[PDB]
Design a protein around this ligand. Sequence first.
Ligand SMILES: COc1cc([C@@H]2c3cc4c(cc3[C@@H](Nc3ccc5ncccc5c3)[C@H]3COC(=O)[C@H]23)OCO4)cc(OC)c1OC
Ligand SMILES: Nc1nc2c(ncn2[C@@H]2O[C@H](COP(=O)(O)OP(=O)(O)OP(=O)(O)O)[C@@H](O)[C@H]2O)c(=O)[nH]1
Ligand SMILES: Nc1ncnc2c1ncn2[C@@H]1O[C@H](COP(=O)(O)OP(=O)(O)CP(=O)(O)O)[C@@H](O)[C@H]1O
Ligand SMILES: Nc1nc2c(ncn2[C@@H]2O[C@H](COP(=O)(O)OP(=O)(O)O)[C@@H](O)[C@H]2O)c(=O)[nH]1
Ligand SMILES: [Ca+2]
Ligand SMILES: [Mg+2]
Ligand SMILES: [Mg+2]
Lengths: 434, 313, 52, 423
Amino acid sequence: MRECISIHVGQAGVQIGNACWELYCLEHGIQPDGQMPSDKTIGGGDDSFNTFFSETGAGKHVPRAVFVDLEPTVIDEVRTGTYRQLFHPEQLITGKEDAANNYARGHYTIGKEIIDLVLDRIRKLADQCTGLQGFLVFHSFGGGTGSGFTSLLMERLSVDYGKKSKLEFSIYPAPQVSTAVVEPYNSILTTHTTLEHSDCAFMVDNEAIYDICRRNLDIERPTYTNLNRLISQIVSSITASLRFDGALNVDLTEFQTNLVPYPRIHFPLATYAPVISAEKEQLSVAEITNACFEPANQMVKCDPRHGKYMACCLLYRGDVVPKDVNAAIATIKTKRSIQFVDWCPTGFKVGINYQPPTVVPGGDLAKVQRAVCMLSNTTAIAEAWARLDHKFDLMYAKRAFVHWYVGEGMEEGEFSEAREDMAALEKDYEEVGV
Amino acid sequence: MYTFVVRDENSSVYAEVSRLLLATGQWKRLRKDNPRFNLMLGERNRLPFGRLGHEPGLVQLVNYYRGADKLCRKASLVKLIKTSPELSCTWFPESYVIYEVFLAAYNRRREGREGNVWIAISSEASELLDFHVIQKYLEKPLLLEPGHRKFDIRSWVLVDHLYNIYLYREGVLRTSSEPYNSDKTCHLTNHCIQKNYGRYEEGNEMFFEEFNQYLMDALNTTLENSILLQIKHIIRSCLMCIEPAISTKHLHYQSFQLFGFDFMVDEELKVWLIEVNGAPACAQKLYAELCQGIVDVAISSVFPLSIFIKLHH
Amino acid sequence: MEVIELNKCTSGQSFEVILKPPPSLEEIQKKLEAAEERRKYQEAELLKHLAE
Amino acid sequence: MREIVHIQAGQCGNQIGAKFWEVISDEHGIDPTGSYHGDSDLQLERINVYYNENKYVPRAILVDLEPGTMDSVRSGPFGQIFRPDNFVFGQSGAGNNWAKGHYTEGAELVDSVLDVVRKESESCDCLQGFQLTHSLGGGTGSGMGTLLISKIREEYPDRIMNTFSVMPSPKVSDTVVEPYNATLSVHQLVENTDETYCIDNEALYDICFRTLKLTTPTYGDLNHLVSATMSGVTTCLRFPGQLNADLRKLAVNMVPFPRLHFFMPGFAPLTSRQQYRALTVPELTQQMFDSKNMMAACDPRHGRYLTVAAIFRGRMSMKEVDEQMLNVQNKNSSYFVEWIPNNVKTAVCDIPPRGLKMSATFIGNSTAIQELFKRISEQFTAMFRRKAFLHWYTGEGMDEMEFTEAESNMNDLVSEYQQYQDA
Ligand SMILES: COc1cc([C@@H]2c3cc4c(cc3[C@@H](Nc3ccc5ncccc5c3)[C@H]3COC(=O)[C@H]23)OCO4)cc(OC)c1OC
Ligand SMILES: Nc1nc2c(ncn2[C@@H]2O[C@H](COP(=O)(O)OP(=O)(O)OP(=O)(O)O)[C@@H](O)[C@H]2O)c(=O)[nH]1
Ligand SMILES: Nc1ncnc2c1ncn2[C@@H]1O[C@H](COP(=O)(O)OP(=O)(O)CP(=O)(O)O)[C@@H](O)[C@H]1O
Ligand SMILES: Nc1nc2c(ncn2[C@@H]2O[C@H](COP(=O)(O)OP(=O)(O)O)[C@@H](O)[C@H]2O)c(=O)[nH]1
Ligand SMILES: [Ca+2]
Ligand SMILES: [Mg+2]
Ligand SMILES: [Mg+2]
């Protein structure tokens, strides 16, 4: 059994981290106090759920998690929340003043002041691991901490844990939900600095989550709690294979092996189905599988029909058997525009976990008998890089807001280095995709 | 008040469509690069589909179907017809894309020495390859009288955001003025290539009322029965074939598009598909009526304030 | 068509279906410290201006 | 960061300053004695931003070269809420003379103000910066106020400086030298503030006359408008929300270039010191973007918005707010620069101000603000090309060169706004 350490950075990472660990606890039968009646090995064990939870002699199951924010108000909610007993004080790390939506303030000015403290607290979690496989890092592209401190931590993790895998869940900026005016700048600065250091990154476009919340849950004005509970369901789909018995994606290295043949192009597109309003009809394997190809169920809005596939995994949860998957795949392939790159086999890796998805009691989502998350590495996701790159271009041509970054010690040249990297990234997609 | 931007200045059709939309006092034209638009009259080339449909609280519509080029590029049409199961195709001339199988079938025509002319117009191969798609030349066209003239038919077809397929009831015959010699002014019917020009009809353009009167008088048949059942068939086959690849049914932005299909009628009153034009112009006499219908069924159906045959609902 | 690598357990199963074959701690520290020096320089010009 | 340190200087500064503490003390449920008597917990969540603590004392410092206005505060209703040691006054006044406030009389007093400032900044868990209320047309708030801003910046170079600055207008004027004091001050503000709300006494007057139908407004009528605005634009600093804003995030999102940091505030519904009908969300949105609701006498239809922040207060449909805000950008998309995408932002706060069920506040960084600086530049030049009234300043040690420099710098400021209006 190899352990996974979760790192939640900034507001988006910490609140999404909060949603996930609530879900993990419900899925594993761990109570808010950390007690797990089903775990007959007290004070230890090497079960699959021990990838994410350690154990105390008192039977407490403790997340292998670090929450770090440059400001206290968000992590303070964890310290006094319903799951307060679950976390160690040393796992929650807060600065005093945040990065003011400024990548440079987060990476340079304030990151230099707190990076060693964060790395130390992570060491205390690594030192309890008999075989630590790597990190899951949760953060926004757009925040000052989420972009700037994350990329500093990413650089430092590659140094201090070189042989270890690093996966990202990144909140991609959408004006529908919030957005500082400078979020394109931060998005690109952090991608350029983190590209070398991340093995696989799952982008979640806040516009996709917002729309799914309005359209499929009939929430008029979705909140962060609406957004995060939906996001954490998808995150649970993705991380379930590390936390449960199975054969597909059982260690972080397999995510790269299954989804990322070409190292820079390491952003799989995630599609999730079904999402059903709790206040509001049981979909079939063929129906939920076909929904994986409707653009309205993607975590990033784009058209996969206009790109090429490099890898494709279907992660089922609930009442699903292989016979029904293969039939649905035969049907879909003769009706949908699914074209793979000429240098990769046209195939699906399928995983089934029999436990139906769990929902948060009193949440907006309804219990369903089966659900599926598709992870596909399509060049079509480059649409999202182009949109972002274009907004960067508009502001950078007048150097609007640049002075706040230079004011923190950054050089104007980091901007254009960053942009040129994304120009190269966009081209890598253009070659593989047509 | 709806808002639109204009990104194709050379479009005569959408110059008129914008001139009409403003003329209702309910539409407002913005600068080229304002993203806050309801409708994009976009550019022929490198239209940024990836940036459409991401503006909060804006239904966005564009006048081009992303992926429709697979029909409107000559190499692509041949590939699409050949490899689509739903097209396999008795109305598309034999075609080969070359940058060998050609030669093969060419010899099978040397065998019985039957009509072995091809276009890219030559009679022997090695003169063509020394000079793309090689396409069987239709040696027995239907010739108009008086004049022993060639022609082609241009049909205007509008696909709306619901993927309803509307055929404009006015077509155009683009006729040759020098008689047909079994030199190319009598072989290529292009409206530019002719300007003998202007003899029989104003501008080498015969409209449907007169072609139908002609066919009634000369051949004892109608435009509908002899030709138009076949045209409606080809349009529907072509566009239903690509409907899955290009449709915007559950997409974050919607599409419509005007197409010009080009047909040829041989002397057995069979219709063949020449090519599909993705950014066509209109006949001057029809600009008014057709552009208003674009506004009526493609733009107002999405943004509320028939000269069309429904091929699809 | 082909279905390969079927792994069953009590928790679920997995398989593959195939439809058609085919920086150092020093260089970072330098960056960090260079930025901090440019900040220091900019504050020095500021206090130098204010002293004028 | 949490704490803001508030400074009010001069006659106008202390009057709009006193009204501001009156309004927001009511909103946060703090009585004139400093005791909390409110019913909602949202009232206490971020009270630390503006109050020291079970009595709450405003983190406010009162400054004047004349005892008069401050004495009125100590004898008014809330005068017993301010910390007595935070009153710092002289006796000779500044004679509506920028040079006296900045160089002679104010210099004598400024070190005693910096003492109180230091005392408050040391009780701060994490200081955000400072907000100064003052007018630009007198001498204490104008001349001493900007002298303070410079000295605070020297000792706290890394904290945010923001001001509410009342601009003089001949329609509401105390003396002819106001264009001189204003031009000298704007020069300082361009260099030493991060964000300045431009409150134009001309606009406040026109609103009281033309809209609230007051044939002869007093300074009280104008200051009712100012306090309502000051409560509006600080709503997001003082109340728990989803954005939870602060002075630095405000500067980063609103100021694309360091010099262009002068904001037009706007309020709806505009009220006099009642209509019992609450407004609808379409009405708040149309009114707050109307020029007739702008607190700086500039027509936004004469320039372009660089950035905009809006806040809606009251119980209403967030979906309707979103619908209306996106509508106004469509009907005006020519008035929002294309090189700053998504440059309009919308916040919602549940607690409305006193007396209203709904209200909207607007903060705009619009290039139309050049009209206000062109106005002041004209008035300055009309007197300065004949060296009129100059002796009041040279008699305090000032050379004519300083006037030449300040004028040129505002003219630069105007032209810099014109550059981005055409970009
Ligand atoms: C003091 O009052 C106020 C201040 C501000 C500004 C502001 C100003 C702007 C602008 C954006 C923002 C905005 N951006 C965001 C939004 C949401 C986020 N969500 C998560 C993380 C970061 C975020 C960043 C504010 C974050 O904090 C501030 O101070 C920012 O574009 C044009 O000009 C806005 C107010 O209204 C929205 C407001 O209230 C009236
Ligand atoms: N989906 C989702 N997005 C969030 C959440 N919280 C913030 N965001 C988004 O994250 C982006 C801003 O990043 P934040 O996490 O707030 O920034 P931060 O890391 O705390 O950085 P600073 O506050 O500047 O120190 C915006 O685009 C918001 O839309 C959340 O809980 N869920
Ligand atoms: N197989 C064939 N047999 C006979 N004539 C043919 C032919 N293919 C093309 N032609 C002739 O060649 C002419 C050239 O036009 P064609 O339709 O081939 O390309 P094009 O793009 O120049 C027309 P447009 O721009 O209007 O779509 C046609 O008008 C037709 O008369
Ligand atoms: N809006 C407003 N303006 C004022 C008030 N008092 C004075 N003014 C204006 O402020 C300027 C005079 O400055 P004042 O504050 O009296 O001078 P100071 O005490 O030396 O700083 C003139 O432009 C007046 O129009 C007030 O209470 N409200
Ligand atoms: Ca155990
Ligand atoms: Mg934060
Ligand atoms: Mg006075």
